[PDB]
Structures are given as structure tokens and as C-alpha cells.
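Support case: user asked for a sample of complex input and structure output to validate their parser. Sending the pair below.
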Amino acid sequence: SGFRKMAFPSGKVEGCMVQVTCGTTTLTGLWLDDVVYCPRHVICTSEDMLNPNYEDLLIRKSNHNFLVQAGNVQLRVIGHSMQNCVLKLKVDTANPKTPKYKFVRIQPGQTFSVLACYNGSPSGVYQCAMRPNFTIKGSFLNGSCGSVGFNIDYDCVSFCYMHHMELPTGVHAGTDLEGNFYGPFVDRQTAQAAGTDTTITVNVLAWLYAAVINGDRWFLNRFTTTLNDFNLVAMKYNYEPLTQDHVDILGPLSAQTGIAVLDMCASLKELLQNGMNGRTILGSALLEDEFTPFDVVRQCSG
Amino acid sequence: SGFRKMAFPSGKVEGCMVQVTCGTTTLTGLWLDDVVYCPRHVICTSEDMLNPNYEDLLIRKSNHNFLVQAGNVQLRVIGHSMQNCVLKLKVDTANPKTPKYKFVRIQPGQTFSVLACYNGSPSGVYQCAMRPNFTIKGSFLNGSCGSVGFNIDYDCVSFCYMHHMELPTGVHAGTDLEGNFYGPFVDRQTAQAAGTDTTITVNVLAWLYAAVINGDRWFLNRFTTTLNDFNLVAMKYNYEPLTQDHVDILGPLSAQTGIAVLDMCASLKELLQNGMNGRTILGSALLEDEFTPFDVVRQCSG
């Protein structure tokens, strides 16, 4: 028993992390086969970040301007290529520690593990959700840029995220491994609006199921509700609309606990309307939305 | 910026995790050099756990009764030895992936990373504190027993914890790697009292410093206080007494933020007495005590 926010084991990803240096700039890169992936703003000084013409900036750079190191092992670069907001540095040496891997673009509400690095050196690991407004609430310092988010499906590492920017807000923005930003964000040091940060309703419900599985059943009410009635309450509290697909995804958890989804929705309704009255659920005084149904079942079953 | 509960990278520990089977019982073991460490209750059936005579139970077992596997690689056992509550299974093959390592007994209030396994297979990683009552709030299922807690000091993995028991309470108990339980607990399926679960005051303060470093400064009050006056309030709310050593440990954080320890203590006093009034600190509606000063500085500096 017990329920913790839990990252995937990071070993497979640790052996892929390298230091990418270009001029004065140094950050973290991802070394897979004979290609190193990194934020394209590695070519930028601090002054360039205000209004960068990446194409023009990149043209001053040749292969030899990129120092790629993998812990005292300086790789050699034999070809470079900008793909959207990522640089792809071809190298002579293929990473012998390359895991089975995929590149995937993740959806809002889905979770992933972040291996936070500094200048190519793994520092630690934590679990994140891609929030509805396509930000994450991470922990990244100078050097962390190029730190990656991933999921592990049995043997395959699925890379979904690379960290690029910290907003003036403090929250974090990044790309998939093809270099496309999650959200409207750009790799430019300017004012950038993250939208309203809504809550992932299906996750909150998954978490409430986890709490019941773990013996916290106090919230369970004597009411029920419909989707419409629930969603009218959801919209009020900047919660995501709950759809039928959401209900279906929660079915296994419903089947395990013997609690229908709408019954659990009614519990959530009252919690939202009436608060927690100073009580806690799974050792939290807030409604938590960074656990997917998959995460709950993964941690509960095996 | 940003502040997250963060585990150490687990790669070094992943390559040490093995499956230990004895009769019907299977759990996780730690393979270091030519020795495998595991909970001694691996020799127990469910019936034995009620009132085990470990010495008598172990005598029925010979070397060949222990099946040690490291992912399709069945190790061979050439000597066995019970050390307190751990079994030490000597084997022919030395782990080639043995990291630089130490065994350390950790103190109450100190943190560590748990690599949660099932039957020798790493499942995930999260950060824990050894609580004042020598329990942890983990996540362990059947198979997780023998999962280990560790810290990484640059090159050296320092193993501090092995998971053995879940209490009827739900909270978790275990040993150091020499097999001595943290706390009064025994490896017997019986009713076992964990004491009053007090809060780690120096950690809470470390966390409050982290919050100020990250821009949450709302709690900061116009008062100050003494240690005695503070500790009289601390005792009331089952907080650990704050000592002078605690003050000294917080000095760097005090020096960074320009906020004296006692000034921060007065903030904490009011929070304890007046609550949070529905506000949050670092995205939490509770006072968090599982971040040491080291953890805060590690994550803030680099």
C-alpha cells in the first residue's frame, strides 16, 4: 500500500545525456545513435535571445563550433541541422548505451518523468504533467536546458519533452524531440502568455480512486450526478470538461472499487463547492491532478 | 527556478537489483560484489510470519534453496549468513555493475531516494524522509520488500534503507543494510506501535527558505522570536524542538536570503497558530517537512 508521486527509473536515460557547448553557451543534450539533440538556443548569447534570427545565427556556426562531451569523452561532429527548435548534431561515435527508444508528442493531461540535468550531468528525477495550458511545473536551473521528459514502456524509452525556456511566470516551456513547442511558446526572451491553468479532471478522479483504494473514503458522499450538471460545476472551478472517454478510461478503477464514475464525480463536486474543511486526502490538503488513471493502476497493481 | 521533490538518478542502483526466491517466497535483493542482501523473511511463508523463529527456519534452508536471478541470469549461491534481519547470500559471480558504495545508518529527519522494485525489477523512484518515529511514507506492494533507499555523494552510492514490513497503520518499516531496523519494529506479522509522528522543524524551515528563494514571501511576518518561545509553540503542534545545531545548518540559507533563522521561526509560529487561511506555499496547502537544508541548497545551487 501507500501512494507516491513516482518517476520512472532513469538509468536508461542517464547514459544518453551529454554536454553541448557552442561558444560561451553550455547546456544538456540527448545522445541517441549517431545524433545529439539539443535546444537550438545553444547558439545564442544572452543578447541574441532578445530577438534571435536563428537561421542567420546558425550560419556563422560550423561543425567545429560545437563541443559535445559525454563525461570526459569529447565527441566529434560531422554534420549539423536545425529541425524546428532543436539542433541535430551528427557525430562519428554512436552512443553504445542507446536504449530502445521512440519520439512521441504527448497530450495535455498525460504525465512523464523528467531527468533534470546540468550541463549534461543528471541531477535528479521527478514526475510532471503536461498541463492543459501546455506548461509544466518543474525544477530547472541554468544548465538544465535540454533536460528531457520520458515514459518507459517495458523496454522502450519514449522521449516526449525537452526543456527550453523558463517563463517570467516561473513555469516551464519546451518542445517534443522533433523541436515543436508544446503550446504557443517561442524560444525568444520576451513576454509570453501562458493561458488559464485549468485542472485535469480525469486525473483528480483517478487520484480520488487511489485514495479509496488506500483507505481514505471520507469524501465519499450520498449523492450522485450527471455529466452536464457536473461539467457546469467543473467550468466554474476552471476544471476541464469531463467527457465520455474520460468515464471509459476510469472503468477499471470503477470496476476495482465498485464505485461508479458519476458517484465519484458527485464527491468531487462537493469537495469543489465546500472545500476540504481542513482535512486531507493521501496526505494532501489540495486536489491533485498530476496522476493519470494509468499511473494509479501501474502503482496499485504492479 | 521551480521547486520539486526530487529523487537521485537511479541508474547506479538499478544494476544492483535482483530477484531472490526461497520456496514460494520471492522478493527484491541487492547484489553488490559477490554478496546479495535481502530481507531475512524471504525464508518465511505467510504462516511463519506470525511467530517466526528465524534461526530454526533458516536451518532447514541450504544454499541450493535460494534462487537468485538478475534478469534471466540465475546466480549460484555458495554460502549464506543471517546478519540481524538481513540474509547475506554469497554468490560465485561478482556484480560487474557494482557501483562505488557505502552502507550508512541514516538519522531521523534525513532524506533518501527509494528505488521501488517488484521481485527484483525496478518500478519507480521517489524521495522519502526517515521520520522522527522511524517510519517512512512510501509506496510498496507485494514484491517491493527488499527495495532500497540511497543517497548519491558524487561517485558513491550510500545505501541507508531496505524495506521489510508494512504496518497495520499502512506506514512502512525497514532496516539499514546491516539488518538493524530503524525504530522499535520487528519482522513479525503482529501489532506494532509507531509512536507520535512529529514534524521535522528544521526541514519545514528549509522549505520556507526555498519558498522565499522562489518568490513566495507572503508568510514573512513583522515579528521575531526566541528559541524557547518558539519551542514552547513547537511542542504544542508536535514539532521537533529546534536546537542551535539546526540554526547553524540553516545559516547558508539565511546568508543567501538575508533572513535570520529566528525571523523565519516567527513566520512558522504564526502559520502554526493561525493556519494558512486557504493560501498555498510552493503549490502546497500544508507545511512540508521532507526537504532537508542540503536538499534545498542542492536543488537551488546546482
